[PDB]
Each structure stands twice: as C-alpha cells, then as structure tokens.
Amino acid sequence: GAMAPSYRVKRMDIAKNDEECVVNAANPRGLPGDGVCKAVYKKWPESFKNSATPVGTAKTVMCGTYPVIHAVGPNFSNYTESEGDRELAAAYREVAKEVTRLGVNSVAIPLLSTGVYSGGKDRLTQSLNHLFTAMDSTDADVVIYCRDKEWEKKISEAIQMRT
Numbered sequence: 001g002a003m004a005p006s007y008r009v010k011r012m013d014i015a016k017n018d019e020e021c022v023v024n025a026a027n028p029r030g031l032p033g034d035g036v037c038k039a040v041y042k043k044w045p046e047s048f049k050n051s052a053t054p055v056g057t058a059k060t061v062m063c064g065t066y067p068v069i070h071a072v073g074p075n076f077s078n079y080t081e082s083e084g085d086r087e088l089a090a091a092y093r094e095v096a097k098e099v100t101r102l103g104v105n106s107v108a109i110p111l112l113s114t115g116v117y118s119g120g121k122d123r124l125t126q127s128l129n130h131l132f133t134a135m136d137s138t139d140a141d142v143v144i145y146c147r148d149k150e151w152e153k154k155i156s157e158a159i160q161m162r163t
C-alpha cells in the first residue's frame with residue numbers, strides 16, 4: 001500500500017503512465033479496439049493473450065512482469081441506463097479486487113464507458129463516482145488518465161472536493 005493513499009488526475013496517454021499497473025478500457029473480445037484500448041494494445045500487445053472477459057468483469061494478463069487489468073465496461077448503446085449503470089459499477093469493483101490481489105502501490109486508470117461506449121451521453125460524474133466507490137477501500141495511489149482539458153478540470157475538482 002501507499003503511505004498516504006491519494007487520487008490524482010493527469011491529461012496524457014495512459015500508455016506513458018508512471019504507475020505499477022494499468023487498467024485497460026477493454027472490449028469483451030480481447031480485440032485491439034480503438035482509443036485507450038488501441039494505445040494499450042500498441043504498448044503491451046502480449047497482455048491480449050486470452051484477455052477476453054464478459055461485461056462487468058476484469059481480467060489481468062501480465063506483459064513481462066507489468067500487470068494489465070482488462071476492465072470491460074458496458075456499451076450504453078446496447079444496455080438500458082439501469083442495467084448499464086449496474087455493469088459499470090461491477091467492472092470497477094472487479095478492478096479494486098485485482099489491484100488488491102496484485103499488491104501494487106499504484107494504478108493508472110481511465111474512466112470506463114466514456115468515449116465510444118458512452119451512448120453519446122456525458123458520463124464523467126457517473127463513471128468517476130463508481131471509480132471512487134470501488135477504489136476508496138483500497139490503499140493504492142490511483143492516477144486517473146484523461147485526454148480533454150475540460151474533463152481534467154472537472155475530475156481535479158471532484159478529487160479536491162472530498163479532501
């Protein structure tokens with residue numbers, strides 16, 4: 001565990017993270033995909049051996065000794081708001097279980113079910129609150145990665161609000 005477990009946000013490519021493991025915003029089929037998933041495939045392609053897993057789950061595959069936690073959030077184009085919310089909360093609970101099991105002191109994590117799984121809705125607050133619900137009982141330093149300047153400010157505000 002970290003001496004003083006924290007949350008931080010950075011606006012940059014999660015493939016360049018400075019943490020002990022990474023969470024991939026994966027598809028259920030273990031395909032290279034697009035966005036974060038494609039960046040993760042280019043950086044850690046070995047971690048996509050037998051990475052397919054159902055929606056609402058996380059599956060860890062090593063790239064050398066570096067753990068890639070493939071977390072599959074729901075695609076809100078396909079799920080109802082209710083069932084999508086339940087699956088999104090579940091994926092983050094499975095990430096917290098894997099982070100704990102691995103014994104890492106830090107993890108790099110994107111906001112699940114934003115971008116192409118958002119069903120065209122702004123889900124910053126929904127996704128980030130599920131992240132906090134799962135990760136608050138863990139003692140890893142959490143570094144959230146985003147690409148948008150306005151999202152950086154909103155995530156930073158939400159972190160600082162609760163300190």
Ligand SMILES: CC1=NN(c2ccccc2)C(=O)C1
Pocket residue numbers: 113114115116118119120121122123148151
């Ligand atoms: C930046 C981002 N904007 N969005 C977004 C998507 C739909 C509606 C509004 C906003 C993301 O998911 C990431």
Ligand SMILES: [Cl-]
Pocket residue numbers: 012013016
């Ligand atoms: Cl970058």
Ligand SMILES: [Cl-]
Pocket residue numbers: 025112113114115116117118
């Ligand atoms: Cl997404």
Ligand SMILES: [Cl-]
Pocket residue numbers: 146147148151
């Ligand atoms: Cl973003």
